[PDB]
Amino acid sequence: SGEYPTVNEIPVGEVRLYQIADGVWSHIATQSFDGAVYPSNGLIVRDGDELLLIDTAWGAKNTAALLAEIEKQIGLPVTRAVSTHFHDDRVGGVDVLRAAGVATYASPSTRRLAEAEGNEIPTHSLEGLSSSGDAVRFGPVELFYPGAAHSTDNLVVYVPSANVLYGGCAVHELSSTSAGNVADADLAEWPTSVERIQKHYPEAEVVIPGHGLPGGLDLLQHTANVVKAHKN
Ligand SMILES: C[C@@H](OCc1ccc(CN)cc1)c1cccc2c(-c3ccc(CS(C)(=O)=O)c(Cl)c3)c(C(=O)O)[nH]c12
Ligand SMILES: [Zn+2]
Ligand SMILES: [Zn+2]
Structure with a gap:
């Protein structure tokens, strides 16, 4: 009823959307992994009379439910999707998307890692993102590679029209x-990668994590703090 949804509002298999800004939504779903239940986020960005999707809803059935929820709440077709790293909360559901007419994209690094690990593989490679600090445009967003952090391939997404920073995991x-x-992180490089994000997007108004509640720029410093303390 208006607050950001959590698993207590989200049975595994259902998807909720949350309006972040004009033409920007997050999507929230829940999934079981190793005997615990977790929420996860993705993004939806209006792209004229089409939609750009960022990340799957963590599984085939969840991603089908995502497409149905988008049709119900928004009613514009999802034409492209970008997966921001190779884990199942980002690519699990790419086969569903591809069978629903969605063109799926990821960096070559993400595609290689997904293939090697047995995860679903986006169709199209996003060049121009292989060096930390690289940025490319993709419809109404900018994709940015900050360096290794949660994973070596993790991308972040900025919506310039709304100053929304989608940090992913x-x-x-x-x-x-x-x-x-x-498991796949680089705890030593992660603070430096976050510092790159902070430097590149100083005007971000909303910051969306890969899992949990959006907030402001403080999420970036908090992330650096929890990672430095974890490494210790
Ligand atoms: C899809 C998968 O990704 C990794 C993965 C590990 C090993 C393997 C097998 N090699 C496959 C995939 C995954 C699976 C299960 C959980 C996660 C989480 C996660 C996110 C938040 C918290 C709360 S908190 C910040 O700690 O307060 C916690 Cl506990 C965990 C994240 C995340 O952090 O993004 N990802 C998760
Ligand atoms: Zn991950
Ligand atoms: Zn994650």
């Missing part, structure tokens, strides 16, 4: 007490 919510699932 390189950015944690303010309530977080540890750095999440760090």
Whole structure:
């Protein structure tokens, strides 16, 4: 009823949308992994009379439910999707998207990692993102590679029309007490990658983490703090 949704509002298999700004929504879904339930976020950005999707809803059935929720709430076709790293909360559901007419994209690094790990593989490679600090335009967003953080391939997304920074899993919510699932992370480089984000997007008004509640720019410093303390 208006607050940002959590798993207590989200049974696994259902998807909620949250209006972030004009033409910008997040999507929220829940999934089970290793016997615990987690929320995760993605982004939807209006692209004229089409929509750009950032990240799947963490699984095939969740992603089908996402498409249905978008049709119900927005009613514009999703034509393209970008996955911001290779984990299942970002690419699980790419096969559903591809069978629903959505062109799927990721960096070559993400595509290689997804293939090697047995995850679903976006169709199209996003060049121009292989060096930290690189940025490219993709419809109504800018894609930015900050360096290794949560994963070596993690991308962040900026919506310039709304000053919305979608950090993905390189950015944690303010309530977080540890750095999440760090299996594929680089804890030593992560603060430097966050500093790159802070320098590149000083005018961000909303910052959206890969999991949990949006806030402001403080999410970036908080992330650096929790990662430095985790490394210790
Ligand atoms: C999809 C998968 O990604 C990793 C993965 C690890 C190993 C393997 C098998 N090699 C596959 C995938 C995944 C699976 C399960 C959980 C996560 C989390 C996660 C996010 C937040 C918190 C709360 S907090 C900041 O700690 O307060 C916690 Cl506990 C965990 C994150 C995240 O941090 O982005 N990702 C998760
Ligand atoms: Zn991840
Ligand atoms: Zn994640």
